[PDB]
Design an enzyme around this catalytic site. Structure first.
Site, PDB file in Angstrom:
ATOM      1  N   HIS A  48      74.877  61.944  41.916  1.00 18.78           N
ATOM      2  CA  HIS A  48      76.377  62.714  41.675  1.00 18.78           C
ATOM      3  C   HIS A  48      77.094  61.797  40.485  1.00 18.78           C
ATOM      4  O   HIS A  48      78.044  62.167  40.039  1.00 18.78           O
ATOM      5  CB  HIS A  48      77.096  62.562  43.006  1.00 18.78           C
ATOM      6  CG  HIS A  48      76.663  63.550  43.892  1.00 18.78           C
ATOM      7  ND1 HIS A  48      77.333  64.451  44.597  1.00 18.78           N
ATOM      8  CD2 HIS A  48      75.273  63.677  44.673  1.00 18.78           C
ATOM      9  CE1 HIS A  48      76.487  65.389  45.291  1.00 18.78           C
ATOM     10  NE2 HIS A  48      75.189  64.689  45.296  1.00 18.78           N
ATOM     11  N   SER A 178      63.492  63.923  50.959  1.00 16.28           N
ATOM     12  CA  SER A 178      62.716  63.351  51.752  1.00 16.28           C
ATOM     13  C   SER A 178      63.265  62.124  52.579  1.00 16.28           C
ATOM     14  O   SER A 178      62.692  61.794  53.722  1.00 16.28           O
ATOM     15  CB  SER A 178      61.342  62.870  51.317  1.00 16.28           C
ATOM     16  OG  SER A 178      60.353  62.665  52.348  1.00 16.28           O
ATOM     17  N   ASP A 195      64.187  66.525  56.720  1.00 16.66           N
ATOM     18  CA  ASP A 195      62.786  66.417  56.925  1.00 16.66           C
ATOM     19  C   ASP A 195      62.618  65.570  58.161  1.00 16.66           C
ATOM     20  O   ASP A 195      63.549  64.978  58.607  1.00 16.66           O
ATOM     21  CB  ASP A 195      61.666  66.141  55.917  1.00 16.66           C
ATOM     22  CG  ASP A 195      61.241  64.674  55.480  1.00 16.66           C
ATOM     23  OD1 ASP A 195      61.917  63.859  56.191  1.00 16.66           O
ATOM     24  OD2 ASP A 195      60.676  64.584  54.536  1.00 16.66           O
ATOM     25  N   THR A 197      60.985  63.057  58.711  1.00 17.73           N
ATOM     26  CA  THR A 197      60.528  61.720  58.509  1.00 17.73           C
ATOM     27  C   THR A 197      61.776  61.133  57.523  1.00 17.73           C
ATOM     28  O   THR A 197      61.341  60.868  56.314  1.00 17.73           O
ATOM     29  CB  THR A 197      59.243  61.472  58.026  1.00 17.73           C
ATOM     30  OG1 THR A 197      59.004  62.335  56.681  1.00 17.73           O
ATOM     31  CG2 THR A 197      58.267  61.770  58.845  1.00 17.73           C
ATOM     32  N   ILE A 200      60.952  57.904  55.440  1.00 14.78           N
ATOM     33  CA  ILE A 200      59.834  57.716  55.068  1.00 14.78           C
ATOM     34  C   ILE A 200      59.661  58.647  53.672  1.00 14.78           C
ATOM     35  O   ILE A 200      59.882  59.976  54.034  1.00 14.78           O
ATOM     36  CB  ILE A 200      58.628  58.151  55.673  1.00 14.78           C
ATOM     37  CG1 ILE A 200      58.500  57.711  57.071  1.00 14.78           C
ATOM     38  CG2 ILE A 200      57.157  58.043  55.128  1.00 14.78           C
ATOM     39  CD1 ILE A 200      58.259  56.245  56.921  1.00 14.78           C
TER      40      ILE A 200
HETATM   41 CA    CA Z   1      60.434  61.942  54.669  1.00 17.45          CA
HETATM   42 CA    CA Z   2      79.677  59.739  36.166  1.00 17.92          CA
END
Ligand code: CA
Ligand code: CA
Ligand code: HEM
Length: 345
Positions: A48, A178, A195, A197, A200
């Site tokens: 961002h 993830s 997800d 995990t 992980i």
């Molecule tokens: Ca994951």
């Molecule tokens: Ca910026």
């Protein structure tokens, strides 16, 4: 190259001060080196800060944003009020005192914390860290950070404007989902993972987004949320559509059962994201400060179907290669635990 007082070699002696910053954030931001809420929030904050650049706007005499300039911290009262940046002032406010105490630039700190955060997550690539981000002089314009209800066309176009990133690279950068949870989309519950995990760095995000959506984990009717396939898991419309779009579906599927590609591509794309707004040839390589990433613990396959799921539950979208028939974890379908965030998230 230089040797720091801790005996570690680094690209430049200016990198040695970042070991003090490392010890401080690992203990006092990441609760002893965890891949938890603050780590996830710091990873999001990189995107961002950095994606808020637009050669297209600049070419019409409009400020397009400075990319990785720390503008989202320096101008937090402005940028964190933008809809795509919802919930980021909490992590900005936790980070600010480290920037002040260590006399580093807000953009360098944001890139640093994102790299250290990922190093905490087993399976992560060996993350890079370059310095050389002057303090922003203007806040970013709004309309530069993708939304979960944006079309695949506009997200492709947005990341191509920001960084010349193509549709394949858009898939790689979404690997960050993830190790990620959603605090603000469902107004009834904070910390719904993308997800099963979220601690992980693996391809479970690429497996699980391909499954048929069966229910909302919390409330229905949330803008940019779609049904997910597991209790406690959230799914956003942008991810769901990119996973099925004829341009990106095969790339998305290619990460299932391919740890080397996941790790190598994310290493590449993360470093590229952290250099937006900068001349890479002007930056200093402090990568040797970032901790060595850890392997995924245990002896389970790299990719798997969550319990209760098989190939029959996959909406196969890749016309080139069939979705691989993974193993299915034993027993009843299990609920993904929420990651409660700090106050104000
Ligand atoms: Ca994951
Ligand atoms: Ca910026
Ligand atoms: C390009 C399109 C993308 C969209 C539409 C998207 C959308 C989202 C949304 C809606 C959330 C939940 C935000 C909230 O509830 O406050 C989120 C979380 C997150 N995103 Fe993305 N994202 C995108 C790309 C990326 C990229 C490129 C990265 C990093 C390299 C990233 C890293 C994360 C992380 C780590 C979180 C979890 C935050 C937490 O646990 O607090 N995202 N994203």
């Amino acid at each position: 190259r230089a040797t720091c007082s801790n005996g570690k070699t680094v690209g430049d002696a200016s990198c040695c001060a970042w070991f003090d910053v490392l010890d401080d954030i690992q203990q006092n931001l990441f609760h002893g080196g965890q891949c938890g809420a603050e780590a996830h929030e710091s990873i999001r904050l990189v995107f961002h800060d950095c994606i808020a650049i637009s050669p297209a706007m600049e070419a019409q005499g409009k400020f397009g944003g400075g990319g990785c300039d720390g503008s989202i911290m320096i101008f937090d009262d402005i940028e964190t009020a933008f809809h795509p940046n919802i919930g980021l002032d909490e992590i900005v406010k936790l980070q600010k005192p480290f920037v002040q105490k260590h006399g580093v630039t807000p953009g360098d700190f944001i890139a640093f914390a994102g790299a250290v955060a990922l190093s905490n997550c087993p399976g992560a690539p060996q993350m890079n860290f370059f310095t050389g981000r002057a303090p922003a002089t203007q806040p970013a314009p709004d309309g530069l950070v993708p939304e979960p209800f944006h079309t695949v066309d506009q997200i492709i176009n947005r990341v191509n404007d920001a960084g010349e990133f193509d549709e394949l690279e858009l898939v790689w950068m979404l690997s960050a989902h993830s190790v990620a949870a959603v605090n603000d989309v469902d107004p009834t519950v904070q910390g719904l993972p993308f997800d099963s995990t979220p601690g992980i760095f693996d391809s479970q995000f690429f497996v699980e987004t391909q499954l048929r959506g069966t229910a909302f984990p919390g409330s229905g009717g949330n803008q940019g949320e779609v049904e997910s396939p597991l209790p406690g898991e959230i799914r956003i419309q942008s991810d769901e559509t990119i996973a099925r779009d004829s341009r990106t579906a095969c790339e998305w599927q290619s990460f299932v059962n391919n740890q080397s590609k996941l790790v190598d591509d994310f290493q590449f794309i993360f470093l590229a994201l952290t250099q937006l707004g900068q001349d890479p040839n002007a930056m200093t390589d402090c990568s040797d400060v970032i901790p060595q990433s850890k392997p995924i613990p245990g002896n389970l396959p790299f990719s798997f179907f969550p319990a209760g799921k098989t190939i029959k539950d996959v909406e196969q979208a890749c016309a080139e290669t069939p979705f691989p028939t993974l193993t299915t974890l034993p027993g009843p379908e299990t609920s993904v635990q929420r990651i409660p965030p700090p106050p104000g998230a």
